[PDB]
Amino acid sequence: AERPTLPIPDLLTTDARNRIQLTIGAGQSTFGGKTATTWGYNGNLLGPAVKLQRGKAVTVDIYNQLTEETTLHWHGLEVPGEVDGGPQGIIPPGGKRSVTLNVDQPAATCWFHPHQHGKTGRQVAMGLAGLVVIEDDEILKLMLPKQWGIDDVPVIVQDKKFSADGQIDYQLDVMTAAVGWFGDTLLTNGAIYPQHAAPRGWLRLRLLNGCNARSLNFATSDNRPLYVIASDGGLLPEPVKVSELPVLMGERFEVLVEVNDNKPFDLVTLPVSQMGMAIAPFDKPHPVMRIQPIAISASGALPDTLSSLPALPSLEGLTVRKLQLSMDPMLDMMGMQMLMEKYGDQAMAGMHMNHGGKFDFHHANKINGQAFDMNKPMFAAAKGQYERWVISGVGDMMLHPFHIHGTQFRILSENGKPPAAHRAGWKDTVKVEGNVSEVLVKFNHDAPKEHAYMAHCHLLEHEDTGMMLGFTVLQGDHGL
C-alpha cells in the first residue's frame, strides 16, 4: 500500500590504492509489477555517486560486462579529451578501461552516462547514468545539508515507456529523431513515485534531468519556494528563490527546500511547452516524490552568500565560433506529422519508400551543414583562452539543449535573452530553441584528434542522428 522509499545511490570514494571500480552490466528491474531488462553501473539500473575532491587525482577502473561497446562521459568535468569519454572512448564488451581524473574545478554535482556513437539515447534509456559529487574546501565551510541520503539527496528524474511484455520500448526512428524519445512513466532514482523521509529544517535536493528528450519544470505541491544554490558547474554567488525551476536534459541544479513537521508535500514537475511532452499524464502537474517530514532537527544552513562569481570577461577581441544547428526540413516535418497523427492536438498543447542513403534520418540532423563526423573534428579551439561560441537554432522550432564537453562556461545570451539569475553562473548546457545563444567558454585541458571533445544537442536522439561536432584543444594563440 505504501510508496517505496527514494533509492539512495551509494556515495563511492577511493580505497588506499586510489581506485573506484565501476561495472557496466545488464540486469533486471521491476516496474508496475512487470520485469524489464535494464542496465546499470554497480547494479541493475542507474549507478553510484562518485565522490571527488578538488586538487586530487583518482583512477577509475571501468569494466564493460555488456555484450556491446559503450563509452563513459563525465558530464560536466573539466578533464582532458583522453578521459572525457566521448564516442572515441570505446570500451570493448568484456573489456576494461582505466581513466585518471585530475580534479581541478569548484564543488559541483556533475554526472556520467554513455556516449556511444549513434547509440547514446538507447544506452541512457536502458538505464545507464550515475552521479559525480565534487567537493572542495570552500563548500564544506558553508555548513550546507550534508547527510547523504537523509538531508542531502540526489533526485535523478527520467521518463520511460514500456511495451506490453514489460520491456523498455526504445526506438530511434523518423519520429524520435525529430521530437525525441519520451514516455508515460516517470522514474525518480529508478522508482515510481517514491517517498523520502527528511528531518525538520533544510532539505538539499540535487536535481538531475536524466530524460532523453523531456524537459522538466520542478515545483512544490503546496507552493513552498525552492532556494537554488547551485547549477551544473557549482554554487551560485547567493541563493536564488524560485517558485518553479525549468531543467533541460542533462542539467543539474541543487535546491534547498524547507521541511516542517506534520506537512507532507510533493516535489512535482509542471507541464512544459515542448512538442510531445504535455500528453497525459504530463498535461497536468506530475508527482516526482513525496517528502515526508520527520520530527528530528536537521542541522544544515542556507547561507546569505555561497561563492564568489567572477565578472564576465570583456568581449573585445575574443575568437567567435558559429555553430548553426539544423534539421533536414523534410524529415523534421515527417517526424512532427507522425507525432500529430499518433497523439493529435495534445502533441502541441501549450506551444513512404526507400530513396537511398541521401534521405536517411540517421544523418538528418547537423551542425554547420554537416552530420557528425568522428573522423574529422571541425575546429581546433584555443587552450586557456576565453572564446565566444554562438549557437543558433534559427530554422526550426525544436528544443536543443546544447552541451559542450571539457568546460564549465558562462551564458551571455540564452536563446535571445540574458540568462535568469540562477542560470548566470557555471553551466555546461544552454537552451537553444528557435533563436540564438552565446556562451563564454574556456578549455583548460587538451583534447587531440584521437580523443576530441564533443559539442552537441543533448536531446539524445538529435545527437545520435548527427547534431554533434568534434573539436580539439592543443594550445593557445602563438600569434603576435
Side-chain angles (χ1 to χ4, degrees):
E2 276 196 62
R3 299 186 179 93
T5 50
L6 178 74
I8 301 300
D10 290 359
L11 185 63
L12 233 166
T13 59
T14 38
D15 45 64
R17 272 175 199 171
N18 207 34
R19 302 223 179 205
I20 294 163
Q21 323 275 124
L22 288 183
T23 291
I24 319 169
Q28 283 211 331
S29 301
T30 304
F31 305 102
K34 284 194 198 319
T35 285
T37 303
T38 53
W39 301 354
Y41 302 115
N42 296 357
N44 292 300
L45 183 79
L46 280 185
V50 172
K51 192 168 155 155
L52 301 178
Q53 189 80 21
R54 179 175 208 161
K56 297 195 163 143
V58 309
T59 294
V60 183
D61 295 316
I62 305 165
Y63 303 84
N64 188 10
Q65 298 179 354
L66 303 173
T67 57
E68 69 180 78
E69 288 186 350
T70 196
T71 78
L72 196 164
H73 171 54
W74 304 98
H75 189 128
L77 256 62
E78 305 172 12
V79 293
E82 285 83 348
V83 302
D84 184 56
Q88 298 161 299
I90 285 212
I91 320 180
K96 179 219 190 172
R97 293 284 181 280
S98 293
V99 293
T100 292
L101 301 186
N102 289 296
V103 192
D104 193 22
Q105 68 191 275
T109 310
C110 295
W111 71 300
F112 66 97
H113 62 76
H115 226 292
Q116 180 68 17
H117 188 210
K119 299 185 164 63
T120 295
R122 171 156 187 273
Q123 298 200 337
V124 173
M126 291 298 298
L128 293 185
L131 284 167
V132 179
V133 177
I134 310 179
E135 300 199 324
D136 63 18
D137 293 325
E138 176 184 74
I139 196 167
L140 294 177
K141 294 165 166 186
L142 298 180
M143 301 309 300
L144 290 163
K146 77 168 106 71
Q147 303 296 157
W148 184 260
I150 304 178
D151 68 359
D152 178 10
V153 300
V155 185
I156 301 173
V157 184
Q158 306 182 113
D159 66 338
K160 293 193 196 298
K161 69 180 187 193
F162 306 89
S163 54
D165 69 353
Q167 297 307 329
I168 299 183
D169 182 26
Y170 183 78
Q171 58 282 132
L172 183 63
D173 62 24
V174 54
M175 189 178 100
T176 62
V179 298
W181 185 74
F182 64 84
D184 61 0
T185 306
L186 200 66
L187 301 183
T188 306
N189 294 356
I192 303 184
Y193 195 9
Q195 59 178 310
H196 176 73
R200 167 179 59 231
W202 296 117
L203 172 56
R204 174 184 188 181
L205 308 176
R206 305 175 184 247
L207 299 170
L208 171 69
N209 183 346
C211 304
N212 280 36
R214 177 178 297 282
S215 56
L216 303 169
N217 183 16
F218 294 108
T220 59
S221 57
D222 61 7
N223 300 314
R224 66 186 68 209
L226 302 180
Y227 293 88
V228 192
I229 62 173
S231 53
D232 309 323
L235 293 167
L236 296 175
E238 53 177 26
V240 179
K241 191 182 179 175
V242 305
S243 62
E244 303 188 349
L245 183 56
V247 185
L248 308 170
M249 299 83 83
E251 286 187 333
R252 298 81 58 207
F253 288 102
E254 303 177 39
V255 302
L256 268 56
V257 61
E258 173 175 10
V259 179
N260 40 263
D261 291 3
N262 300 315
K263 202 155 213 290
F265 70 93
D266 299 301
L267 189 69
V268 305
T269 174
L270 307 173
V272 305
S273 304
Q274 176 181 357
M275 189 167 295
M277 304 305 171
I279 306 305
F282 297 97
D283 56 325
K284 303 176 205 196
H286 195 96
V288 177
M289 74 172 198
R290 163 65 54 84
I291 285 104
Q292 210 73 61
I294 303 303
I296 300 172
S297 184
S299 70
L302 181 65
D304 270 357
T305 308
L306 302 162
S307 63
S308 180
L309 188 70
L312 253 60
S314 170
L315 296 312
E316 186 58 37
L318 299 182
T319 298
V320 163
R321 305 198 185 280
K322 293 184 294 142
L323 297 79
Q324 176 66 68
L325 305 181
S326 66
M327 305 179 58
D328 174 89
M330 111 97 116
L331 276 302
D332 190 22
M333 278 153 68
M334 281 186 57
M336 285 183 51
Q337 183 185 245
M338 294 179 78
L339 187 75
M340 296 312 301
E341 287 178 353
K342 183 179 169 67
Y343 301 108
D345 296 328
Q346 201 54 214
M348 280 219 110
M351 301 305 303
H352 186 68
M353 303 298 285
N354 190 345
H355 288 272
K358 182 180 173 78
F359 302 91
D360 188 353
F361 70 79
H362 294 107
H363 59 241
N365 299 117
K366 308 187 211 273
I367 306 180
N368 289 338
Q370 312 164 238
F372 175 57
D373 181 16
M374 193 158 66
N375 328 108
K376 194 193 208 329
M378 192 179 290
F379 55 86
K383 183 161 106 157
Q385 320 188 324
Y386 294 101
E387 299 184 343
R388 210 217 309 195
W389 285 31
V390 185
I391 306 128
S392 174
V394 177
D396 68 78
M397 296 304 312
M398 296 301 191
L399 176 58
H400 308 287
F402 202 77
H403 177 44
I404 305 169
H405 288 207
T407 189
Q408 291 295 333
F409 57 70
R410 312 297 301 283
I411 300 164
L412 305 190
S413 180
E414 181 146 51
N415 208 42
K417 220 180 177 82
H422 65 278
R423 309 182 58 87
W426 301 105
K427 298 287 277 89
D428 61 49
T429 302
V430 59
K431 190 190 182 181
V432 177
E433 181 176 10
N435 210 290
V436 185
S437 298
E438 301 206 337
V439 306
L440 183 68
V441 61
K442 168 149 123 65
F443 305 102
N444 303 133
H445 305 90
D446 285 1
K449 168 172 44 71
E450 287 66 39
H451 299 285
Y453 284 136
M454 302 287 110
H456 70 96
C457 185
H458 214 280
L459 187 160
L460 305 180
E461 286 62 47
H462 293 167
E463 169 194 332
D464 285 338
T465 57
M467 198 169 289
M468 175 154 65
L469 64 78
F471 66 110
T472 52
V473 184
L474 290 172
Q475 59 219 9
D477 296 346
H478 288 189
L480 290 299

